[PDB]
Amino acid sequence: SNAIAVGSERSADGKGMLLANPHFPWNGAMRFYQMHLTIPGRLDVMGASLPGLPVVNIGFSRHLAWTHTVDTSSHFTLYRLALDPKDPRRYLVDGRSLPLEEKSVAIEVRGADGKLSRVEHKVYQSIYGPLVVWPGKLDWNRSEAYALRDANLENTRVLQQWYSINQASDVADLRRRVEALQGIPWVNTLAADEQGNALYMNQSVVPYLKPELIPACAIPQLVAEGLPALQGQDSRCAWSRDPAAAQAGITPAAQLPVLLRRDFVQNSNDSAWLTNPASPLQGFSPLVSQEKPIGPRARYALSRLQGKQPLEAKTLEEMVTANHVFSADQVLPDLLRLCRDNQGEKSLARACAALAQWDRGANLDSGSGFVYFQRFMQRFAELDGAWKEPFDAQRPLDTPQGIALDRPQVATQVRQALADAAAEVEKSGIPDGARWGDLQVSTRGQERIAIPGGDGHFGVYNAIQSVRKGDHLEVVGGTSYIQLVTFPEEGPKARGLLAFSQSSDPRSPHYRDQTELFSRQQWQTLPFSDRQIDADPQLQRLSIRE
Template sequence: MTLFPRSHVPLLRAGSAAMLLALAACGDKDGAPADPAPKYAAEIRRTAYGIPHIKADDDGGLGYGIGYAYAQDNVCLLAERIVTANGERAKYFGAEARGATADTAPNLASDFFYRLINEAEAVANAWQQQPAPMRALVEGYVAGYNQYLDERGKGGLPDACKNAPWVRSMTTDDMMKIVRRYAAEGAGSHFITELVSAVPPDAAVPAPPSRAATARRGSPSVIDPQYWQQQHARTGSNGVALGKNATENGQGLLLANPHNWWNGDLRFYQLHLTIPGKLDAMGASLGGMPMVSIGFNKDVAWTHTNNTSSHFTVHQLQLDPRDPTSYVVDGKSQPMIRKRIEVEVRQPDGSLATRSHDFYQTDVGVVMRVPDQLEWNRKVAYTLLDANMGNHRMLEQWRAMNSARSLDELRDGIDRIVGLPWVGTIAADKEGKTMYLDVTVVPNVPLSKEKACVPDAFRELAAGGVLVLDASTSACRPGNDPGAPQSGIFAGASLPRLQRDDFVQNSNDSAWLTNPAAPLTGFPSIVSLDAQEQSGRTRIGIAQLQARLAGTDGLPGRRISMPQLQGMLFSNRVYYAGQIMDDVLRACDGERQARAASGAMVDLAPACAKLRAWDRTANLESNIGFGYFASMWDQLYGSPLFWAVPFNAADPVGTPRGLRVDDAAGVTALRTALASAVLEMEASGWGLNSRWGEIQHTERNGKRIPIHGGRYQYGIYNVIASEPSKGGGREVTEGSSYVQTVMFDRNGPQAQAMLAYSQSVDPASPHYADQSELYSRKAWHTLPFTDAQIAADPKLSRIAISHKTKGTQ
């Protein structure tokens, strides 16, 4: 049912926001003066699955429509996002609680961090640097969100925030804070507790416990390259662009498969944005961002994957022996700047108390502490310098991409603006050209400076792309390039890129193997690493493309269609099973009994029978063999008894492979792992005849929707991660999110997509679970893009909204 509040004008046929302006300019038939023309006007057409198609005559009206539409679907999510970005979580939710995702810091630490990075001066500077169209877009968005709140009232909001004290009107400052919160996702937000735990040596105030010492116990610390490899793999993405030498019709074809959390700030939202004659782009946006982040227009389609460049540098301060809060640069002592941040904290009785923390700032960032690795003592301290805290160009960057008319124009805009914070770009156009651009905000540390400025103790970290620089000399600061839009970062044109007529791809490894026929080499460590072992997703992605183009995958021809590209994603092949399962089954040919790591003797015969019958996928119908394999892999991977053929940079797609089953120690280790896997499956309640679709699910309004796919570490292209749920089975936490394929033909872009977790977080919404059902069935939805396609959608509804008040600041 479509609601028409007083400010809405129903449209009985296709129309434009211009109709509202024209009507407002006319007086009534008695000659009475007309109402003032609306400051903002937009039309919101919704098609199947609640996708809003927002049309306006200018940027302000477009932002207004986006803000209103997003609030209709996710008002509580945006209201909480405002609380987070303003550092007010502890005020409303308590100090120790956490946000929606498992890796978030406790509220108090989160508040200290966001109050620090979103100080008034930084926010004002971000706003001042927005071009006029971006200001209009944001002001309109704020007006749209606020109008929705006014119309509904706090008592009319969804249960998650109904009458909540933390729901309030939005300001343009709030939007800048949210944008800066997204920018920090590439570095600073990972260091929250490390920053908050840093206090001067011998300080009377005890340091708060650090995430490195608590939640990460037994895991790599935040300065370990392995930590960042895991982050890129977990919430990373797959992207493939196919060109005229690879597609059936000789035009471009794109697969977008970003992975992220299914809850919280990084959820995608589908939308279609139109300013007639200026902009017409469709796809998905990070929640609260007023443009298309991943999508297409009539000329170009693009997607993003988290890249492996480091977006931060760590700096080792040589301290003044007289004062551990002063440091020496070029032989001269200079004081740190102490910045006190105060936060209100809700107490158990509901009262508020003020807590404070002192951060210590320098010209190379904020002092932090990583226990047992980077300590603040009387000789040295360490700072974090997040390059994206100077990046105020994100809105401008995506807007330029949304309106790009060719692949060259897309590239030129990215090179000029350098506003993408931590994602590389994969794109295809209607002419059949493809491109990968690894152009993001990266500290300008060339190899020569790395060699001269990284202390010997940190050379191993530098080899993995994490740089600790000597701060005692100003020559070791990140350099300035006159071609860069920001001091201290590389110019866009100096960063990796590849244009091809066959394919480019990325699955969160470095730019090196974008296409194995043209490796990208010779870049600084902080930008892209060469000759590194590739993830299973990269390997299966390249292997599938190569087999299809060579005609060796059992299918006819040597070209790729859109259904075939979709099939590569949703085959749910467990890549590493193809590398080791023959050896596992050889080990099954031994004695029936094997000793588990616990010492218990286990009968392997039933498990081995299931492994032989397993189809080596993570599909809904896959049997318990997947569980046995996953448990074995978790136990064995990385051990010295693992690979029979080690990684070889000359064969990066084919290696490493095989298990060491030709020696007794390797066989024993494998059989022990298999016996332990049997016990683990029994303890988990996964019966011998269980199917994966009976185990992994997302629960919506009491209904369990089975979800296919599996964890990244098994080499499954379609990443889905899940955790044990209270009622048994496993609840999805992260993985494939907005999934899109776009094929260009003579009629323009032909797009199919699905949003795996659906459009709304409100359980009362009809779009809370509908696309999750699609995802479960692997049922692609054809996106209506043209006016004719939108008008033909049987689920079409329309509203026109207008805004006549002026308070939006």
């Protein structure tokens, strides 16, 4: 997901502005749906929501727009259990042997013969929660096992939370409402209001452990790789209690990252750290936020947002619709130099041609250079010490950068990676002169629609994840609900689309209408006022009761 909130000090009109570009599945239980909700006098909010929820999840109201992105905070902890040496179904806490609890569930299974039979399954549970097995990583042997404590299992506040967000007047109100309830499960919240405030909140349900407990309560092997894991044989590694927290064992709101500015805040699924580099967010629990290198999407956005020029709605739109493959900025210049250094190597010919001709985009009419670049980058990712300038904590925006071609071993490995990438691209049955839009599609009935955008891991702000199906890449997730909101005098001006359209049913008039528009990148008015709604030549009305 991406989010940018712009404040009074940077917007072209001196008021708030928000770009909402969440990256979510195109199918299933997390498929966004547009709606506008009004109880005249006390609720008027519009945006999009997930299936089955009678609230707006990402949206706007008269003076406020808000959105969300997936945070890097932990919302659970694994507990490594020390097992009773005499019984692997018992575990030790403070050296005392405790029995695991058993909860059986019974499931009906439809058989080959069309009849039902009953399967019973035992779920083992500790005081922390259920046991989990990842073969070869988190085993359950005679010495140890792993249990999982999920912080959101006790979060009964989630629906009230979004209903409250829906009623929020401005940024300050939104912040009070979220900090009071702490019902948000696993997302950041970014917002802008009419007065020109820009808010970032890393305000979600996060396991709390007092700072002095971490060095001894962490599982050192697992924290390296960023898995939240604690020592489950010591009672002092229970989540810490603090009366200010809305829920027992969670981090109090005052201890979670918040940034309130009048210039800008952004997030692209990295931690709170560089929300705005002028004011780094630091010193939080490792369960909350760490100073890790940022992904190429955030790096791209920061390259567009830094400086002193005013930001226009159009600028934020084009950050999405440009389809720029920002990862290309870091490696393509040097990759092209290596290409020139190997002129007349038959194996590299087609790849170097494609890459030099490439517009560096994931547009419908982008050349096969994108496909070569992708397969190269997958291999480049797994080479050691190949960066000319590796990640530099003191220059987190501009590193890593370039290929260390001056090292002979690197130059050999990079050229080999390019040859390997080219071979793979050429094996697949890509027609001559075929473009990115010829490959990446969304299927609608027996038809296909070309979809612009590319994987977020290549720094395409317009992130689109696709999988191979027959002769094409089928879009499965990414850019979904788009809203771009400004606040001119008459009322909120909202512009956007729902990429995959309102309806998942092929029979619907609204199965592909917005998908056609997304293909052509033609964003539309999101009508909110009675005046806007009434101007719509397609207006239909039905009143229902029972």
